[PDB]
Amino acid sequence: SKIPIWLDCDPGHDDAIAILLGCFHPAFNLLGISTCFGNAPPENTDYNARSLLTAMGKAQAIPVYKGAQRPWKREPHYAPDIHGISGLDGTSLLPKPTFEARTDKTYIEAIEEAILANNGEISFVSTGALTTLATVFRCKPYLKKSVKYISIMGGGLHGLGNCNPNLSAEFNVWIDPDAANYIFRDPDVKDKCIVVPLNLTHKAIATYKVNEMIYNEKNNSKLRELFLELFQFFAHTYFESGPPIHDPVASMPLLEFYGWDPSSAVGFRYKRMDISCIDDVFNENSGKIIIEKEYPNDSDVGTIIGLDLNIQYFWDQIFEALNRADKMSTIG
Ligand SMILES: [Ca+2]
């Protein structure tokens, strides 16, 4: 009756909105969160996640584990330019977290539980690196055939990117190309992977119209203010229309595929392709996506590559979630 999910993220301004959806959208049973390295160091992305949940009141519902703390191979390089030093700069409203990251078990064990608990029905959602999920599947490969979908925000098609000398690579793939390949090339997994690339996410712009919706004379919670202050800082690091909010877009295909709403509503269109990426770090196009193969639209084989969705609908979902979050705000 409700889409069970695990979220691996690196908050992260756009990742904060991913958490908001998974916590508060009526369609999602969030089973837990794993934080990886990426936008900031792993200690920051951990704290940032637990701070958000504490602000939204969800710090005693949503289990938090520390995920992958570093890439498989490459030296960790973070993004201070876009996200700041804490990885979530621009808002002082973020409260000191009530709860610790849980240590009853490894994150691999926690994800193992969650998958088996929702055997065949769960979807894993990576808004950060693919290191967390690639490690789970290395260590516990039996778990592959239990996950229904893996919804990834990452990659860019046709040499679209925000990383590497040529801007040919997208961040989440670039920070661990090995982990990405291990996912994209595995025949068990690649066929049920959903990829939401820069091509698609760059449609998810937070314009003046969107900011009005988050904060206005009718609706001016401090929680609402927090989320506004994120959108603003994200925009300051840019698209004159405003900044794209990449990570929540990975939730939309699930709403269509699990059939929360009709495809007419969600409007999620996609292709079927095998993909890989350049994982030689010394390569100038390090991380750039290669399209290995392409398939007819009725194909079962191939990674599911997002092309278009209804951006109106996207935003309606975020606002829906935000009105419920507002009721559970712990910071005024
Ligand atoms: Ca992210």
Numbering used by the authors: 4 to 241, 247 to 340
Provide the authors' own sentences about this structure as they appear in the paper.
Indeed, URH1p was initially classified as a nucleoside hydrolase (NH) with a pronounced preference for uridine substrate but was later shown to also participate in a Preiss-Handler-dependent pathway for recycling of both endogenous and exogenous nicotinamide riboside (NR) towards NAD+ synthesis. We show that the URH1p has similar catalytic efficiencies for hydrolysis of NR and uridine, advocating a dual role of the enzyme in both NAD+ synthesis and nucleobase salvage. The crystal structure of URH1p showed that the enzyme belongs to the group I structural homology group of the Ca2+-dependent NHs and displays a monomeric structure that is unprecedented in this class of enzymes.
The asymmetric unit of the hexagonal crystals contains two URH1p monomers, covalently linked by a disulphide bridge involving residue Cys142 from both chains. Making only marginal non-covalent interactions between the two protein monomers in the asymmetric unit, it is thus evident that the URH1p dimer found in the crystal is principally caused by an adventitious disulphide bridge between Cys142 residues, not representing a physiologically relevant quaternary arrangement. The URH1p structure retains the characteristic open (α, β) NH fold that is composed of an eight-stranded central mixed β-sheet (β1-β7 and β10) surrounded by the connecting α-helices, a helical domain that completes the active site, and two additional antiparallel β-strands (β8 and β9) extending away from the core sheet. Since ligand-free group I NHs typically display high flexibility in the β3-α3 loop and α8 helix, we infer that the contacts with the Tris molecule found in the active site stabilise the observed closed conformation. Indeed, the side chain imidazole ring of His86, a crucial residue in modulating NH activity and structural dynamics, is within hydrogen bonding distance from one hydroxyl of the Tris molecule, and this interaction is likely pivotal for the closed conformation of the β3-α3 loop. Further contacts are observed between the Tris molecule and amino acid residues Asn42, Thr130, Asn165, Glu173, Asn175 and Asp255, whose homologues are involved in substrate binding in other NHs.
